[PDB]
């Protein structure tokens, strides 16, 4: 089984049909396995089918630039619980969408997801990143150690050392002739 | 037409190849050794020669300056205007 924090996801059928821009990152992300079906975003999507505090200036810029996300925030303030909100955008192609729990507003964040060229990645934990790198380092170091110890021969007459695999007068000629 | 000719000639379009998918002609080696004999012989004509060094053997891409029962030193030049090596 491949865990969710370790895969890159894209839907190029969705890219060919709809095309990804800033206005459809959230329902593009809704087709990803990263998206939770029990989320407030999806349930208010079903409902619609049927100045302010509590946000950083990075999200203020996104809200004041894009009106549909102010509509989304105004509809999400009525509910409490899990949601996905779009935090940082670089036009034309970079996004960050964060899992977020909201209580009435007191907001704590959760795992994030960054979008680079319609290719969605889940933000891994920095422990997991450095831990995988140190697993690779430890494995390669252990292989180096074992292959080096295979080259070690011990003798009592000397110290421990490496296993052995199985004309002086020309300068005087030079200095005498020249 | 360029891609059509590449594919219908080699079975492949012409792209840079870094791995296996040259060869120096031995007749060209023989010809270059003959003209290298001609090059050392066309070079030594313009230079004066020492009297004990008049024995020179002219074969095999180079010149054999020999002094009998003493030594035999072999030298090559690359072109007309470069000194011997």
């Amino acid at each position: 089984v491949t865990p969710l924090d370790e895969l890159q996801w894209k839907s190029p059928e969705w890219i060919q049909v709809f095309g990804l821009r800033t206005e459809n990152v959230l329902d593009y992300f809704a087709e990803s396995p990263f998206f939770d079906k029990t989320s407030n975003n999806q349930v208010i999507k079903m409902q619609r089918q049927f100045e302010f505090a509590y946000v950083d200036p990075a999200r203020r810029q996104i809200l004041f630039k894009y009106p549909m996300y102010m509509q989304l925030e105004e509809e999400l303030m009525k509910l409490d619980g899990t949601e996905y909100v779009l935090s940082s955008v670089r036009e034309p192609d970079f996004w960050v969408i964060r899992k977020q729990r909201r209580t009435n507003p007191e907001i704590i964040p959760l795992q994030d997801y960054y979008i680079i060229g319609a290719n969605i990645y889940q933000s891994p934990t920095i422990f997991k990143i450095v831990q995988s790198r140190l697993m690779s380092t430890s494995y390669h170091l252990n292989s180096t150690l074992e292959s080096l110890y295979d080259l070690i021969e011990f003798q009592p007459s000397q110290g421990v050392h490496y296993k052995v695999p199985t004309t002086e007068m020309l300068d005087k000629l030079m200095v005498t002739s020249i | 037409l360029v891609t059509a000719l590449e594919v219908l000639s080699l079975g492949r379009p012409n792209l840079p190849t870094h791995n296996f998918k040259a060869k120096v002609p031995i007749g060209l080696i023989l010809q270059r050794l003959k003209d290298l004999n001609l090059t050392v012989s066309i070079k030594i004509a313009l230079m004066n020669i020492p009297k004990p060094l008049n024995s020179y053997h002219i074969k095999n891409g180079r010149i054999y300056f020999t002094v009998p029962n003493e030594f035999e030193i072999q030298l090559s030049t690359v072109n007309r205007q470069s000194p011997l090596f």
């Binding site: - | 037409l1 891609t3 059509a4 000719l5 594919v7 219908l8 000639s9 002609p25 007749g27 060209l28 010809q31 003209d35 066309i42 004509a45 313009l46 007309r80």
Partner: protein, 57 residues
């Protein structure tokens, strides 16, 4: 001596006999592999693919 040296190497800077015979053999080997109508059909197949359409920006 030096003017015939110059004459010799400016004549020698020309392609060689085995080289031009290998070129002739390659040209005659293209005869069996290359067909004109198959060439034109394959090239007009590849016309819309192997290059940028020179109409867009």
């Amino acid at each position: 001596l030096e003017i015939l040296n110059e004459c010799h190497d400016e004549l020698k800077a020309l392609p060689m006999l085995e080289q031009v015979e290998f070129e002739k053999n390659t040209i005659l080997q293209q005869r069996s592999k290359i067909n004109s109508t198959e060439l034109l059909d394959y090239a007009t197949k590849l016309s819309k693919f192997t290059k940028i359409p020179p109409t867009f920006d």
